[PDB]
Symmetry: D5
Subunit: 156 residues, 10 copies
C-alpha cells in the first residue's frame, strides 16, 4: 500500500458511518474481525481510522457492514493517525488510560531504562490486547497487555 | 494516613534528590523495593511522587537512600498526583505511551464496552508491571500489563 | 449494551434537534422522564449525549419527542462523553460549578483523604440530584447532592 | 477586612507550611476547625488559601499549628482565589469532580433553568459539606452537598 | 421560560441572519428595542445570542426584522452564553475592554474588597449602559456604566 | 519619565511587599492615595504594577508604606502591564468582569459602532472609578464607570 | 455606517470568493484600489475582511470584481477584525512579521517610551504602506512603514 | 562569534539588571548606543537579550552601565531570542504591534506576493527604526520602518 | 504569480480530492511528478497545499489526476502554508520529525552558530529530498537531506 | 547506565553552567567532542541535556569544562528529553526547523509511505549531522542530514 491520507476527518467520518451500520446490524467487533485472520484490536483500530486494512480484510468487513466501494478503498489507505479530539480525552473510559500515564508515566520511563537501557518501547513494533478476567473479590477486571519492541539509544 | 499534599513540586523536588542519591549509590529500583513487600512499580511510583508509602516501607527505602526525617515523612503523605510537566510528554520514552493512546484510545473504549459494558476500567483499583522478554526475531520486548477493575455505568 | 460512539458531535447534534422538538412541544425534562422509571438527571443527561438509555426508555422518550428510528437507536448507544465545548465553560450557569472546583477543589481532596483515605470519590459509581428549597432569608436555593462511592488506592 | 491579595503564591506557600506542621503534629482538619465556630470545609479552604479567616479563628488555628505572626495575619487577608495549578486538575481525586462537570454540566444547566429559571446557582452565597456514609451495598460513600442561592437573570 | 440551549452556534447563526436583515432594512439597535420596554443593551444582547427575550418583545423585534417563527421562538430560549470566539477577543473594539481587565483587574478586586468586603460584584444581578458624551478637549467619549449587586462571601 | 520595564515580575513582587506593609499598617487604598492629587484607582493600579507614579506621589506613598529608595524609584518606572496571571482570571471577584465581556462584549462592540462609528473606545485615554451605592431592593451595589475616548477608524 | 459584524467567518468567506474572482480576472490589488481614492493597503484589508469600504468604493470594487449586491453591502459593514486563524500565523510570509515582534517587541516598547513617553503608538489612528525598492547588494527589499499616532497615558 | 545561549532567562535576567542600572544613572538608550556605530534599535535589542554585541560595543555599553565582566561577556553571546513572555503580549504598548498583525497580516501577505512574488520578507536580513514626527492635526506620531530583504520561494 | 490564498482549507480540501483520485488511479507521487522537471518533494508539497505549481506543471498533473479547471488554477495560487492541523502532529510518522526537533533543536542552533555564525538556516531558500537506502545492519533507512542557505545576522 | 532523570530542569540548569564555562574558555563544541570518539551532534546534545554520555566521555568533557563530580555524574544519566521551552520555538534559528515541518510535514509522511510503506522513520535509531558547503550563487549553505531507520507498521 503506497496511498496515504493527510486529513483524519475523512476516515473518522467513515468510522461514524461504520458505527451506525454496525449498530443497526447488532454486530460486535469480534464478529466483524472474525475470518479476517487479524486480531480484533487491529481490525477495530482500522475501522476507527487508526490502521490500514489489507485488501482482502477490507473487502470482508466492507461486505459485512454494507460499505460502498469508495469506503472499502478508504479502509486500505494509510491513515493520518490520532484518535483524540483535542489532545486530552474528555470521555471517562478513554481518560482513565491517560490518568495511568499521569500517575505512572515516569515510573514506566524509570523501569524501562532500568530493565532495557536508554531508548524506548515501541508503539509501532507493537501489539495490544484486552482480556476480561474474574476478580477473586467479586466483579471483573480488564487485563490489557502492551507488547512493544525495545529500541535502544546508543552514542554515535 | 489522613495527611495529603496540594502542591506537587514538594514531592517532585524530593524525587530529584532521591534520584541523585540513588545514582551516587549505584542502586536500582528493584533493589530499593526489595524487602518492602511491595511491587517495584508501586514503590518506584512513590519515590517519584505518585503514591504514598506505608511507614515501614518509607523507613526502609529512606535507610537505603540516606534520606532525612522530613523526607521519610513526605514519602508517607498522600500526593498531589500528576507526573507530566505540561499535559503531553516531551520525552520520547514516555511519549510512546501517549502515542499508544492516540492510536488505540478509541479501540480500547470500544473493546471495553464490548466485553464489559458501559463504564470504565479503573486506574485506581489498578496494578501495573513491566516485564522484559526475548523477541524471537531478535532483540528484546517489553510486556506491560495494565490490570484494572471494571466499574459499570448503570441507570438511576 | 455493546455499541458505542467515538465522536461526540453525532449525539450532540441529536441533542440540538431534541431540544428544538422539546421547545416546540412545550415539554419539561421532568415530564419527558416521567414514566421511564429513571431519574430526571439520568434521562436528561442521556438526551444531552452523556448517558445511554435502555431500549424501553429510548422508545418512550422518542415517542414523546417524535424522533425517527435512527435517533431512537443513537440514544441507546454508549456515548463519547464530554459536554463542555472547550474544557472551561463560558456559560455563567455552568461556569459556577467550575468555580466551585477552583475554590474548593483542594478542600474536597483534603477532606476526602481525611475521612476515607487515599483514593477517589467515584464519578462512575455515582449519582446526583438537584433540589429546590426555600431560603429562610427570602428567595430560593438549589441543593445539589453529589453521591459517589469511595474507591481506595492501596499498595500492591 | 479590607486587605486583599493579588498573587496566589503567597497564600499557597503558606498552605504548604501549614500542611507540614499539621502532618508533624498528627492533626486532622476536623480537629483544627473544632472550636472556631466555623464549618470544616470553610476553615480547610482558608488554610489552603481560598477563604479568609476572621481574626479569632486565625489566632486559634495559628496556636494549634504553631504559626508565626505574619502567617496568622496572612490567613485573615482576602485571597486571590484559584486552587488549580493549570485549569484542569491532574490529581485523580480532584479530577473526578471535574469529570462530574464534563458529564453533567449541561444537565445541571438544563435542570437549573427548568426548576428555577434563567440565572445561576451561586458559588458565593454558597455552602459546601462532605459527609461520609455507609454504602448499603458495602463500603463507604461521600455525600457532597452544594448549597447555593438561585440568582435570576431578568430583563432590564 | 424553562427551555434552554446547549450549543451557542444555533443562536449565533441566528444572530448573523438578524444582522443581515438589520443591515438591509437600515435599522439601528435603538430602533429595534424601541417599544419593547427593555434597555437597548439587553435587547441587543438577546439578538446577539446572550439573553432571552420575553415573548412579547420577541414578536415585536421579529416583526421589525421579518424573522420566521422558528427564529422568534429561538430568541425566547435561555442561551448558552459566551460571545467570544476563543477566550480572548481579536477585534480591536472588543479587545479594549479585555485590556481594561489586564490593566485594572487587580485594582477592581482591591477596591471592591475595600469598599464592600470579601465577595463579588455580580455579573448576573447586573445592568449595563453605553452613553456618548462630548470631550471638552474636542471629540467624543463613551461612558460605560457597569452596575452590579454586591454579594458577600461570609464564613459558615 | 523615559525609563521602562520589560519583566512584570519585578513590579509585581514589589506589589506583594507593598500589600504586606499596607496590611501591617491597617491602611486602605483611599488613604494611601490621599494627598497625592490622583484618583484612588490610578494610585492603586500603580501600587499593583499597572501605572507609573509621578515622583512626588511616589515619595508620598513611599513614606506612608515605608518603602526603600529602589522601590520608590520602581514605582516611577513605566511598567510592563498585564495583571492577569494567565489570560483568564481564576479569582471569582476578577472573573465577574471577564464574564461581563463574555456576555456583553459583542453588545458593547455593536453599540459603540452605532453611537460613534467605526473605531474604538480607548483604554489609554481612559479613566475608571468604583462607587458604592444602596440597592433600592436591599443591599449594596457597585457602579463602575468606564470613561474612554472614542478614536475613529477612518479610510486612508 | 452604524452596521457591524460579530462573526468574522461571514466576511472571510466573502474574501475567499473575492480572491477567486480576482484570480480568474487576472487583477492585482493595486488595480482594484485604483480609482477608489483609497490606499491599496486599506482597500486590500477591506476585501480581506479587516476594514469597511465607503459606499462609493464598495460599488466600484464590486463592479471590478463582478460582485453581487449582498457582497457589496457586506464590504460596507464594520467587521469583526482578526485575520489570524489561531493567534500565531503558520504561514511563513505572515510569520516573519510575528517574528519581528518576538525579536524587537520590547525594543519597540522601550524606544516608544523614550521618544514619546508613557502610552501607546496607535493601531487605529494608523496608516500602513508596503514599498518595493532595490537591494543595493542585489535583489529587492520591502520597506514597510507603520505610521501611528502617539496616545499618552497620563495620571488622573 | 561562535558561543550561543539556549535559555532566554539568563540574558533576560541580565536585561533587568541593565534596566535598573540605566534608571539609576538616568541614561537613555540613545546615549548608551552613542559611540558604538550601531543603530539604537540594534543596541537596545542587544541589551534586552535579542541581539549579540561585538566585543568593542559590549565593553563600551558595559562601562556606561557598570557591568561586571561576566555580564559584558554574556552580551556578546548569540541569544536564544524571544522577548514575549507567552506568545501574545499583555502590555498595551507591545500589544498594538500584535494588533497590527491581526488587522493587516493577510494584507501584508497579499501585497508582498503581488509586488515581489512567492516567498517572504526577511526578519533576518532586516533593519528597523523608530522616528518621531509631528502630526499636522496636532500631537505626535511614530513612523516605524521595517526594512527586510525579499527572499523568493522557487520551484526545485 | 501574483495571486495568493488566505484560507488554507480551500487548498487542503483540494488535497483530499487529489489523494482520492490518486488512489483510484493507483498513482505514485513519483509518477505524478515525472515529466514536470520538478523534484518530487516540491510537486508533492504543491499537491498537498504547501507550494505553488508553475502553469505547465499544474496542467500536467491535472491531466494525470483528471482535475477540473478550477482545481488546476488553485494549484497555481500561492498558498496559505501550514500543513499541521493544530501545531503539534498527532500522526506517528509526522510526529517523529517533531521529536527530532525536541531532542536536537538546541544542538542544531548551537552547531549552526558554531559553523556559520549568528543567523539562520533558511526554510525558504531551501531544498529537501528523501532517499531510501539499505541499513548496513539489515532493513532500510531514510536519508532526509535539508539543504538551506545560511542567512547571517549582523549589526546595523 | 540504569539511572535516569524525570525533571529536565536539572540537566538544563547544568547546560547553562556548561555554556558559561565553555564561553569563558573560548571552546567550540567540535573541540569539546574531540577525543571522545563521539560525533559532534551527539556530544553537543548531551551537554544540552538531550543525551547521556558514557563515563569516559563524561570525564573527558568534564575535565575540559572544569565540571564538578556531581555534574560529571549528571551527564551520564539518561535524560528527561525535550529541549523546547514551550512546544513551539521562539528563537528564529530553531523556528526554521519547525517551519520545515509546517511546510513539508505531510510531504515527508507521503514520501515515506510511498518509498517504505506504513510505519515511521525512527527518531531513536537515528543519526544527524550538519555540514557547511559553498553555495555556487554565493555564500554558504547548511546540508543537514537526518538518517533514521524505517520501522514498519504491520497487521497483527
Amino acid at each position: 500500500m503506497i496511498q496515504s491520507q493527510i486529513n483524519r476527518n475523512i476516515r473518522l467520518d467513515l468510522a461514524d458511518a461504520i458505527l451506525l451500520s454496525k449498530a443497526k446490524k447488532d454486530l460486535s467487533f469480534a464478529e466483524i474481525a472474525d475470518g479476517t485472520g487479524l486480531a480484533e484490536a487491529f481490525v477495530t483500530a482500522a475501522l476507527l481510522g487508526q490502521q490500514a486494512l489489507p485488501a482482502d480484510a477490507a473487502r470482508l468487513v466492507g461486505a459485512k457492514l454494507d460499505l460502498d466501494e469508495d469506503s472499502i478503498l478508504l479502509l486500505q489507505m494509510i491513515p493520518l493517525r490520532g484518535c483524540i479530539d483535542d489532545r486530552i480525552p474528555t470521555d471517562p473510559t478513554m481518560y482513565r488510560f491517560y490518568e495511568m500515564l499521569q500517575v505512572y508515566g515516569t515510573t514506566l520511563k524509570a523501569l524501562v531504562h532500568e530493565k532495557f537501557g536508554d531508548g524506548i518501547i515501541s508503539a509501532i513494533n507493537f501489539k495490544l490486547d484486552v482480556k476480561k478476567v474474574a476478580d477473586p473479590e467479586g466483579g471483573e477486571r480488564a487485563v490489557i497487555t502492551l507488547d512493544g519492541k525495545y529500541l535502544p539509544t546508543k552514542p554515535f
